[PDB]
Ligand SMILES: O=c1ccn([C@@H]2O[C@H](COP(=O)(O)OP(=O)(O)O)[C@@H](O)[C@H]2O)c(=O)[nH]1
Ligand SMILES: O=c1ccn([C@@H]2O[C@H](COP(=O)(O)OP(=O)(O)O)[C@@H](O)[C@H]2O)c(=O)[nH]1
Ligand SMILES: OC[C@H]1O[C@@H](O)[C@H](O)[C@@H](O)[C@H]1O
Ligand SMILES: OC[C@H]1O[C@@H](O)[C@H](O)[C@@H](O)[C@H]1O
Ligand SMILES: [Mn+2]
């Protein structure tokens with residue numbers, strides 16, 4: 001297998017940070033040779049599970065989400081979609097590529113948007129089925145579309161994704177939970193990045209750990225009369241501060257061209273918000 | 277725990293490649309916050325085994341090697357030195373820091389320098405003792421001294437170290453084995469880096485795999501009447517081409533100031549050749 005030689009005195013990207021201070025790759029276009037990664041992951045017959053909640057009106061987002069995932073998400077690898085919905089008959093029948101399957105998991109609807117978004121951690125953690133069926137789990141919002149490659153480069157024991165509104169910001173600007181009353185509490189002088197709750201994942205074991213931890217933390221907050229400021233994302237950020245991810249995705253992986261344009265530092269816009 | 281904020285639009289190092297195309301960190305000063313890594317590794321009570329062969333005249337190199345390892349190598353972590361020698365009474369008694377131990381393993385001497393260097397793979401692979409006693413194994417030459425920090429930043433499932441004579445070179449210049457007759461054979465259009473046999477390591481499982489593979493490959497070459505051009509290092513390079521390391525050490529970790537000076541791109545010279 002023949003490819004460009006990496007040269008150690010020629011960096012790929014000089015414009016962005018491509019490794020965290022705990023030596024986790026930060027995933028940008030030009031940092032990876034996908035042909036190498038694809039080979040490595042195919043040699044293990046990797047199966048990737050993709051979880052998405054479509055509760056209430058959000059079933060409307062599934063057709064574009066799944067169609068575009070078929071075009072861009074882990075193409076060539078085994079993929080198992082898990083669609084959590086209160087409306088199984090509303091899941092569109094989208095034609096899938098070979099090695100790809102979809103399961104519909106019927107769940108209850110909470111009235112409040114905070115609990116729908118928040119009880120995802122609980123819903124994800126359903127535990128023995130993921131362990132037997134997939135190697136990795138990827139957990140994303142449904143109001144999104146894939147516009148470019150999202151592949152095995154993201155796979156690692158634990159990853160989070162840089163929030164597109166805060167990647168160029170200083171930590172005191174991060175909208176972490178700042179009340180010491182909350183399990184999600186992070187002091188003003190702490191913090192690596194501000195991760196978005198819309199795209200995280202890892203090995204099935206590490207995702208079950210994270211989601212269990214976040215759920216346990218939110219129940220503690222509830223039994224104490226406090227709701228973290230950005231809810232699941234607050235707790236996600238506290239978890240990833242204390243258990244550092246082994247890869248970080250750049251904002252190529254979570255973007256909104258309408259709000260933020262297409263800056264030169266983003267060579268690809270891979271997974272983006274749908275207008276709502 | 278309070279530290280400088282990484283900023284994603286300010287890279288650490290813009291002068292060197294800090295991640296390989298398969299997303300393994302390349303370990304340079306300024307890429308890592310050691311306080312973070314130290315915490316992570318201490319939380320697992322990590323034990324690092326360091327193997328060194330001192331056969332014949334090479335026992336003379338042990339005092340400086342061990343004294344300087346006490347100053348710089350994994351300080352604060354548990355360390356088990358394994359000294360393979362034909363002369364147990366010649367191992368100097370060096371005073372060790374707390375949590376550090378040394379074992380002397382008596383082995384036979386081969387007459388030829390090629391077989392002394394080459395049979396290390398066999399000698400390392402002695403298998404159940406490493407699995408029970410250490411988490412990682414680091415395998416180095418003895419004619420060396422530590423001059424600066426060599427710590428848990430290097431630890432990963434599998435690592436190799438960039439040969440200091442070839443890091444700025446193109447692959448056709450690499451002195452890989454070029455005869456298809458040899459198990460170590462690498463074609464002219466293949467190859468990522470040229471790794472030095474003087475410094476490799478990983479988890480005990482991955483080092484046992486590598487050393488078993490290299491030994492099996494060299495026995496095949498022997499039963500076929502060919503000796504790879506740079507011996508163990510040829511086979512090391514073939515193994516690491518096909519099983520890509522999960523970290524690569526920069527030449528800060530294997531250098532010779534007498535032959536190569538102190539170039540600006542090396543902010544630290546950590547482990548260096550002793551005149552011989
Ligand atoms: O009525 C709702 C509200 C939220 N969600 C799920 O929870 C996710 C996060 O909520 P949302 O996308 O509304 O949050 P935002 O991106 O606006 O902050 C959604 O993508 C859906 O997967 C849902 O299914 N139905
Ligand atoms: O007579 C010898 C020759 C080699 N070695 C071991 O094999 C390693 C590699 O050999 P050497 O350092 O001579 O190779 P070089 O760096 O010169 O290529 C040495 O560091 C020792 O650990 C040894 O113990 N005794
Ligand atoms: O937490 C800061 C917030 O950033 C907003 O831009 C986003 O819409 C919210 O979902 C939340 O992530
Ligand atoms: O393989 C090329 C060679 O490079 C030399 O500089 C070194 O002394 C040898 O041990 C070998 O590594
Ligand atoms: Mn959303």
Ligand SMILES: [Mn+2]
Nearest residue numbers: 417418419474
């Ligand atoms: Mn040597």
